[PDB]
Amino acid sequence: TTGERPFSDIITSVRYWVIHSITIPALFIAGWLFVSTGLAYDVFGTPRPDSYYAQEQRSIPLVTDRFEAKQQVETFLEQLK
Amino acid sequence: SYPIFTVRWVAVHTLAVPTIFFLGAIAAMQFIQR
């Protein structure tokens, strides 16, 4: 052994489950809402299903300039009106 | 007789906390419709 409490002890203890029957669902729900509120899209810049193309466009918004790439993406996003 | 907040504890939670959050997210994603 190396001094820590056995996991068998911990996960079968009542207190452990008093704590985690709260903390695990809370985290799960937090992630759930991270998606359902749409925040994920905006944090990571991921297109929603209606934001891959403008209505009549069929050209991928491929980044083609290294140093003004940021501006290129911004322009591409404006192009969705 | 045993400590609670150990190196092991930290390691465990740096993996477990994000994992549960992430699983909540992916769960939510299963109900996204185009």
Partner: peptide, 30 residues
Amino acid sequence: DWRVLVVLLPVLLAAGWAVRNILPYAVKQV
């Protein structure tokens, strides 16, 4: 952004809860 509070309210309610429950043993340890 209200979404970050609506999303990270569960995380901080959890942290606060477990802090409340483990406080005496934590103080005893520290």
